[PDB]
Symmetry: D2
Subunit: 115 residues, 4 copies
Amino acid sequence: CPLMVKVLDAVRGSPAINVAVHVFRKAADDTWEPFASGKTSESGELHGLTTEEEFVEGIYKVEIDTKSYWKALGISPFHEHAEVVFTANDSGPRRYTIAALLSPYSYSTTAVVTN
Amino acid sequence: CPLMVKVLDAVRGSPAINVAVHVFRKAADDTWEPFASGKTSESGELHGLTTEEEFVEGIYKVEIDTKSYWKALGISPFHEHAEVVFTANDSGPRRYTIAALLSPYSYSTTAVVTN
Amino acid sequence: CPLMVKVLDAVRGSPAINVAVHVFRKAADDTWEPFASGKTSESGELHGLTTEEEFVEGIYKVEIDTKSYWKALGISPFHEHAEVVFTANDSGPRRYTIAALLSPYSYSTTAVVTN
Amino acid sequence: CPLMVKVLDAVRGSPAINVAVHVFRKAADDTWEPFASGKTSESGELHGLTTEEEFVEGIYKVEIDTKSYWKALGISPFHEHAEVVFTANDSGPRRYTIAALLSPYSYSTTAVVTN
Ligand SMILES: CC/C(=C(/CC)c1ccc(O)cc1)c1ccc(O)cc1
Ligand SMILES: CC/C(=C(/CC)c1ccc(O)cc1)c1ccc(O)cc1
């Protein structure tokens, strides 16, 4: 899957491997509650963050640790991190792919939402 | 400017006009303190957010109200907003341009940082 | 596969299906010779354009018919098409994935190259 | 202007200076005729390619020499160049700004069209 995060590296032209991703869900008290976490695989993908039943209606934040990624490569990047915040599953179940393309001073994200 | 935010609309091929932008600076208590706010002009640009002297070293969050923009056009977009979070002015004064390209299910941002 | 093309729609947050893709190899007269073609599937993907044996070193042009895609949705887009021109296999056989994210007035493309 | 091209570097967070830009107009033999050329300035901008009087209706190709740009920085990039092909002035005179954001394996381009 219901949630997949895919991260590519625009400098090297490869998947961005081992990028930490933390997901949060907005709580009733308007706090961000830790919902899930993982690291992208060798293919730059992170599957298994949640299940269909667990991925309930709500507002989610997907936080991608871009800074740690670039610093590990010896680069001081511009952004502290990259966040994607969206309402999910408010009109029935969907499969969400959050895709992110990274450069040291830039990132681009899109969502692919299907049945 | 020392800080400029520029927003374009990829559906219409024009500046994104009247987009609300809120800027915050991280406080000692690790809270986000309201730092500035404005709306993009007819050219999709927002100048005059701060001055050189006021734009001190720190971590800033630039929050772009993409959701209100799309909803006003009768579109239900994917993202709640678009945020850009970065350290600024920690190696001398700089001019920052935060540029953002918007589509209903996607945005792309880059920074241009000069002397 | 060694050549894969994937096309996403940034406005609707979906794969772009049935998009015409035409590939060319550069000739010693600087003319562009037809190499292969197809349309994207329901997942927005186009596989099987070529084989590891037909895909020798050269300069290739990948043309994606974005105009037809948009016009069918009732949209009059900016570009005639999106183009990706690159040298392939110059360092020995590789697998290429060309991704294109589409909006009426913008396109973004990236390449993942694997060995 | 009626034709402006602006090129940014997503890796360094700076304008891309001295980037060669070649424009062509499509001919009735489907051949590409030289229309105008130049290099970007220190602000990454190229103005004065053409006049409102030479810029009649037609299909134009804008070619940006991204390869030379990267190789000078010691980087072996993916693309031979970045291309933007579009119909112009078909609805009467307009002003076009073509923006390109560059990374070694990716480019993103958008158009702002004004009347
Ligand atoms: C084209 C969208 C996309 C990407 C990959 C991150 C993208 C995102 C933003 C851009 O500006 C360009 C491409 C992508 C999505 C799913 C994949 O399996 C592979 C690629
Ligand atoms: C090319 C970067 C850029 C933009 C405009 C928002 C951009 C951003 C992300 C992309 O994927 C493509 C273009 C821009 C920056 C300053 C300007 O005066 C005009 C345009």
